[PDB]
RNA sequence: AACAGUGGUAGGAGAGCGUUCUAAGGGCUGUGAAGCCAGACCGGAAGGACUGGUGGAGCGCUUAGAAGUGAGAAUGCCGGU
RNA sequence: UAUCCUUGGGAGUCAGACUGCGAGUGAUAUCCGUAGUCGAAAGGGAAACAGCCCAGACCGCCAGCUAAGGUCCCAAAG
RNA sequence: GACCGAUAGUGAACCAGUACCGUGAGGGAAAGGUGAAAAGCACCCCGGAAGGGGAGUGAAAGAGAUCCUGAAACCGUGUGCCUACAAGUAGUCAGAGCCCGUUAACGGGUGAUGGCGUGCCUUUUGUAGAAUGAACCGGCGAGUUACGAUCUCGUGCAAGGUU
């Protein structure tokens, strides 16, 4: 028998154009450029999903550095003291509490200074 | 106001709020207790060196589910290499009732 | 010289910005004429603000 | 609301649109006065369409003149005639004689 | 889930004198203050800096022979146009512009950098008109 | 195919180097491969056929779907009589009638019923018996089938 | 369970998704089928449902069989713009 | 430490590139032996830079420790 | 008939070896569908007419003569968010403000700012290339069948197997 082959290509091509909604100009209407761009955004997301993990540690480090320098310490000395004054396992994210409640952060800095000298 | 450690990560919890964490392998309805309490805030302040001694945080489980689907697609130009798959990471939702310092 | 590449819709629409007409000069009906043009005759009877001609 | 449509008038689009841009949203008497004073090809056609719409509104739906405004007005494209023009060195070129539809909808303000 | 910042901030006013201090060793600190890295609520995509007023900008200092050797170039986009000025003329004729150039070269490029630069006020001499803003003296920590 | 479509034979006319107007990629060109007349049929060893017919016959006996009756006789070729005979037994679905030699009255009486098929003992086969549900067979046909196999 | 492993072109091996036709059973349609349009649903991928509009008479599910079996490129062919 | 042999079924490839280490040339202004990487390999450092240095991507996390390289501001850290 | 269903099947489902091209031998197309039934829109209004708006037939007039269904490219009208100090393979991650409210889901649309980021295929030792190819959309378009050779797997019988 003969398989005419209709109703299959349109259904598959239309799904590609639906993911390209919101693109600039002909990139959201023409099939070829839409497919090219959807493929390119495929690994742009994979690359960024791992950069995001190392782009917030930098922010936390900067904020902790500023907060510590408000007390007379530096970031490196404060971290060494914390690692040595016991440990007090505290991710930089959870040591960002300098922004919200600054008093406790000063207590932690005081403990680190007490052990550091 | 307590800092607890779970799922290889750390979170800050006060009673009455709801949080999403990694799978606890607990059927929805029972009560879980977190043992690793690092910090306690509010009025008096307690700082345990590895942990605060004798501190347990209570929570109850009401839902275990999966997040929105993420489609992972990668390819290599001019070498005809494609790969596509999907992912839905499981999660467990819990609300705190007693910090219990 | 031939075009190097086609022009997108946005560039064409932006080029046609100044390609439009103008609203004409509107004046009074001369000798109950029909809304004649400035410094000209009435459409009805060739009137100049009531001064009919032709 | 009253509607009047003219189909396949021998006038290319993008030429009727220039005039139609002038009379969109204006009062009926002002629109007619504007159309009577611009020397272009599409003005007599658009004036006839507008007056047909006015007559329909007055007669069929029993509406009133001196109170109507041009609520909607647009020009669409229609079937195209294709012709051929000979050129130098035994070549041919294509000519597109285009046609348009004109629609006007008036309503009480 | 940390906290960003959005328009709910306050900008203080600081006054720094440039008597004796060297060029770069002051410009670096001033730029750091301008970007807002000295406060725990830092945010990369939002302006969180302060306002910096510099007085006595004509008494700046340079080490070595740079005062007669450092040359400022500019190009006018016309053929053969390359204008040059020695540091001595820049110091004795346009003292504020040298400081502005030194600080501006130390700021990030883009829209936010150019909007950050608008908070710097440089005055030759020991007098400024910014009185209603109540400036607060600030020494160079570094 | 390419060499049977009427026309072609010459070059059509920096365009692509066309060779014929009946090439496979043109609008009305020839067909590459596609159907061709042939015959689908093979044969199996005789013992395989014998084992197959034995198995399909025994499968019905396993679940008592074989009804053997003393003899089948219809004086008149009336479809009403055949319907009455079928209703007398518990036969409501398609059934297969097997009789020794050949009876004209039975063949002409059950012909029009939608689900009934009449064959002789010599014409039994696997597909016919595996298709119909209930198999009615005359005792003489049983004996002759036993003799043949 | 406990250990161990999972980059990949030319290539070798394995498991699967879809389209048209045929055979039996089982059953959906004028109380609206195929097709077309929209949506914030479901699987690890190829893919599959569920609601609403249009449409106005034919289609699908389970197990097998047979193939004119899946299109982004050939200065590809035809048509429309 | 887990690779090795024999038989049988399928292949593709057929006188590549650069950088270190030891011998012989143009005119030490290509040759052979040996090791690596790219070809078929993403990530971090050399400002950008197939072949140099570190190191081998099943997927997710707003967790931690380090290699080459670094800690005045661009740009995380003296 | 486990053959096609209007780019398929004869070149030709239609006044087809016709129209058209060539002095001549010769080459050689494109083009199916109102409705069960013409019941194919009497009559009124604008208009020179074409074309429209009512009324009417009909289950449907958005079935009105190229008339079942009506996709994409292409052309327009209205509106929610953004946009006139800004350097751009335009996407991806983070993110204020504004507008909504779904197959209720750690929802939808838009998007100031910050980081990163030299299209697709072919070929080559090596390509972002200033090495080749594509104006865009849609349809058609490439590992088969017959007879022999050898190997793997399955079934029947077995010193026999088989027409």
UniProtKB/Swiss-Prot annotation, chain A:
Top-level taxon: Bacteria
GO BP term, pick one: ribosomal large subunit assembly
Keyword Lipid metabolism among UniProt keywords: no
Family annotation (PROSITE patterns): RIBOSOMAL_L20 (PS00937)
Classification via Gene3D superfamilies: 6.10.160.10, Ribosomal protein L20
UniProt keyword terms in alphabetical order: Ribonucleoprotein, Ribosomal protein, RNA-binding, rRNA-binding
GO cellular component: cytosolic large ribosomal subunit
One GO molecular-function entry: structural constituent of ribosome
Family: Belongs to the bacterial ribosomal protein bL20 family.
Quaternary structure and partners: Part of the 50S ribosomal subunit.
Physiological role: Binds directly to 23S ribosomal RNA and is necessary for the in vitro assembly process of the 50S ribosomal subunit. It is not involved in the protein synthesizing functions of that subunit.
Name the record gives this protein: Large ribosomal subunit protein bL20
Source organism: Bacillus subtilis (strain 168)
From Swiss-Prot, chain D:
Entry keyword set: Ribonucleoprotein, Ribosomal protein, RNA-binding, rRNA-binding
MF GO annotations: rRNA binding; structural constituent of ribosome
Cellular component GO terms held in the UniProt record: cytosolic large ribosomal subunit
An individual GO BP term: translation
HAMAP family (alphabetical): Ribosomal_uL22_B
PANTHER family: CHLOROPLAST 50S RIBOSOMAL PROTEIN L22-RELATED (PTHR13501), LARGE RIBOSOMAL SUBUNIT PROTEIN UL22M (PTHR13501:SF8)
Similarity annotation: Belongs to the universal ribosomal protein uL22 family.
Assembly and oligomerization: Part of the 50S ribosomal subunit.
Function description: This protein binds specifically to 23S rRNA; its binding is stimulated by other ribosomal proteins, e.g. L4, L17, and L20. It is important during the early stages of 50S assembly. It makes multiple contacts with different domains of the 23S rRNA in the assembled 50S subunit and ribosome. The globular domain of the protein is located near the polypeptide exit tunnel on the outside of the subunit, while an extended beta-hairpin is found that lines the wall of the exit tunnel in the center of the 70S ribosome.
Record's protein name: Large ribosomal subunit protein uL22
Organism: Bacillus subtilis (strain 168)
UniProtKB/Swiss-Prot annotation, chain E:
One Pfam family, short name: Ribosomal_L13
InterPro entries with a match to the protein in the record: Ribosomal_uL13 (IPR005822), Ribosomal_uL13_bac-type (IPR005823), Ribosomal_uL13_CS (IPR023563), Ribosomal_uL13_sf (IPR036899)
SUPFAM superfamilies found in the cross-reference section: Ribosomal protein L13
Superkingdom per UniProt: Bacteria
One of the record's GO cellular component terms: cytosolic large ribosomal subunit
Gene3D superfamilies: Ribosomal protein L13
Membrane-traversing stretches: none
GO molecular function: mRNA binding; structural constituent of ribosome
GO biological process: negative regulation of translation; translation
Keywords, ordered alphabetically: Ribonucleoprotein, Ribosomal protein
Quaternary structure note: Part of the 50S ribosomal subunit. Binds to Obg (AC P20964).
Family statement: Belongs to the universal ribosomal protein uL13 family.
UniProt cross-references to PANTHER family, sorted A to Z: LARGE RIBOSOMAL SUBUNIT PROTEIN UL13M, RIBOSOMAL PROTEIN L13
Function in brief: This protein is one of the early assembly proteins of the 50S ribosomal subunit, although it is not seen to bind rRNA by itself. It is important during the early stages of 50S assembly.
Name of protein: Large ribosomal subunit protein uL13
Native organism: Bacillus subtilis (strain 168)
Gene name for this UniProt entry: rplM
Swiss-Prot record, chain F:
Keywords carried by this UniProt record: Ribonucleoprotein, Ribosomal protein, RNA-binding, rRNA-binding
Keyword Hydrolase found: no
GO MF annotations in UniProt: rRNA binding; structural constituent of ribosome
Disulfide pattern: none
Domain of life (superkingdom): Bacteria
Region (Disordered): 1-28
Transmembrane stretches, start-end: none
Family under the similarity heading: Belongs to the universal ribosomal protein uL4 family.
Functional note: One of the primary rRNA binding proteins, this protein initially binds near the 5'-end of the 23S rRNA. It is important during the early stages of 50S assembly. It makes multiple contacts with different domains of the 23S rRNA in the assembled 50S subunit and ribosome.
Quaternary assembly: Part of the 50S ribosomal subunit.
Protein name: Large ribosomal subunit protein uL4
Organism: Bacillus subtilis (strain 168)
